[PDB]
Design an enzyme around this catalytic site. Structure first.
Site, PDB file in Angstrom:
ATOM      1  CG  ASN A 147      36.156   7.720 -37.765  1.00  0.00           C
ATOM      2  OD1 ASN A 147      35.376   8.973 -38.147  1.00  0.00           O
ATOM      3  ND2 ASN A 147      35.836   6.704 -38.246  1.00  0.00           N
ATOM      4  CB  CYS A 169      31.774  11.011 -43.525  1.00  0.00           C
ATOM      5  SG  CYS A 169      31.034   9.627 -42.045  1.00  0.00           S
ATOM      6  CG  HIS A 199      30.267   8.514 -37.834  1.00  0.00           C
ATOM      7  ND1 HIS A 199      31.334   8.046 -37.217  1.00  0.00           N
ATOM      8  CD2 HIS A 199      30.267   8.189 -39.365  1.00  0.00           C
ATOM      9  CE1 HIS A 199      31.914   7.469 -38.116  1.00  0.00           C
ATOM     10  NE2 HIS A 199      31.496   7.469 -39.276  1.00  0.00           N
ATOM     11  CE1 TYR A 242      28.195   5.298 -38.839  1.00  0.00           C
ATOM     12  CE2 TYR A 242      28.691   4.718 -36.630  1.00  0.00           C
ATOM     13  CZ  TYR A 242      29.031   4.756 -38.093  1.00  0.00           C
ATOM     14  OH  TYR A 242      30.185   4.006 -38.338  1.00  0.00           O
TER      15      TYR A 242
END
Length: 416
Positions: A147, A169, A199, A242
């Site tokens: 990440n 992802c 995200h 997110y």
């Protein structure tokens, strides 16, 4: 036949990966899977490395599992390289989540200050891995889980000659499974045009048996999370989880503060779970479907399937508001020559500003990660939507710089 090197072998999710390769072995002739890690995690590697051996021989599938702390050996002649490592460990993550809370700012691993510092920790190591790959395996694909995957991808595109990059992802698969459950249908009947960033991804259009049901799904979503129905209906597209950091910021900060003061932050909870799980791996779920998507992508590349998967890749104009050089997360045709993004046109005006802010953040943050320039880091922190001011930005920056000294070789050249 294929050699696959996995940096971050000592990870909890490692069994999910090998399970994936087992599932797909007919399609994917993986001869050897090298699980690599570093001295400070070789207990974790030998624990999970051993279960991995049981699993493959128990399933009667002939992948040779190799364990090492010398990644040059694993990279030697590799066809694919996966990254699933954590720099500074879960203790470094805990600092990311705790420090900003003091200032009334979001503390989270990929969003806000903590996403800045995760990038700063991670990309130097990714730049290293690429140095090794441009020698031991210049033909190989880099498949990155690690990440801020969007920021990671950006840095590799801008500061590196590694054109064979993809970022995975797990959010898009979660969303597909979510909308399907809502519709009360098997997920294979649901397609979603995903577009945005890692995200930071929207469902622009949802289809049921190939016929658009977006409005219908949006009515479901708000009416059976916790979106204001008229906001969601006004927006006309489906946000990811997110997006709550940006459109429900007060709610996420309250959750974090609460968690920090009770159960623990996510990294402290994840630590408990991780400890009582290596103990499970001693002799013969939910959290992430990461390696599932990694295996799908590798198999599709290897087989030239040209099926559609959402991944992180070079925009090349798929989204008009984003630079052609920049990384985007969009539906792609997966070929043997790599992911081929499907033209989106552009994001709806409503959400186009937010994505441009995060991109601005990603780009300045990725620059600071490679140069170690303090002013550049301070700008990244200050422009982030979740940081109130330059004054607070500097305070957090200086505290976090000091907190993560040991893992910041571009900022602190020191002692080992």
């Amino acid at each position: 036949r294929l050699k696959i090197a996995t940096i971050g072998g000592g990870s909890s999710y490692t069994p999910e990966l090998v399970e994936g390769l087992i599932k797909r072995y007919h399609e994917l002739p993986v001869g050897e899977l090298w699980l690599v890690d570093i001295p400070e995690g070789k207990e974790k590697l030998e624990i999970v490395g051993a279960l991995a051996k049981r699993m493959v021989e128990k399933a009667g599938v002939p992948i040779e599992i190799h364990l090492t702390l010398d990644r040059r050996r694993a990279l030697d002649g590799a066809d694919f390289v996966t990254t699933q490592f954590r720099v500074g460990g879960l203790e470094a993550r805990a600092k990311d989540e705790r420090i900003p809370l003091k200032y009334g700012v979001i503390g989270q691993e990929t969003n806000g200050p903590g996403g800045l510092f995760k990038g700063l920790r991670t990309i130097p190591v990714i730049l290293d891995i690429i140095r090794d790959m441009e020698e031991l395996c210049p033909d190989a694909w880099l498949i990155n889980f690690t990440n801020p995957a969007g920021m990671v991808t950006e840095a590799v595109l801008r500061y590196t000659k590694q054109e064979k990059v993809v970022g995975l992802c797990n959010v898009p698969i979660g969303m597909r499974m979510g909308v399907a459950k809502l519709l009360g249908v098997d997920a294979d009947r649901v397609h979603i045009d995903f577009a945005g960033l890692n995200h930071m991804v929207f469902g622009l259009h949802v289809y049921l048996d190939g016929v658009e049901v977006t409005e219908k799904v949006i009515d479901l979503v708000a009416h059976p999370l916790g979106w204001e129905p008229d906001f969601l209906k006004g927006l006309k597209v489906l946000p990811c989880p997110y997006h709550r950091y940006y459109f429900q910021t007060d709610k996420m900060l309250a959750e974090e503060l609460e968690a920090a003061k009770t159960k623990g932050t996510r990294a402290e909870v994840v630590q408990q779970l991780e400890k009582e799980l290596f103990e499970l791996y001693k002799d013969p779920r939910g959290g992430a479907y990461y390696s599932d998507a990694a295996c799908s992508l590798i198999s599709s590349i290897y087989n030239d399937k040209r099926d559609i998967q959402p991944v992180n890749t070079r925009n090349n104009g798929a989204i008009a508001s984003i630079s052609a050089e920049s990384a985007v997360e969009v539906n792609c045709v997966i070929t043997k020559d790599g992911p081929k993004p499907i033209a989106v046109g552009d994001l709806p005006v409503a959400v186009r500003g937010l994505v441009q802010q995060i991109k601005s953040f990603e780009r300045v943050a990725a620059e600071a990660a490679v140069t170690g320039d303090y002013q550049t880091a301070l700008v990244a922190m200050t422009i982030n939507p979740l940081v109130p001011s330059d004054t607070i930005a500097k305070q957090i920056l200086d505290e976090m710089l000091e907190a993560h000294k040991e893992y910041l070789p571009q900022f602190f050249k020191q002692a080992k």
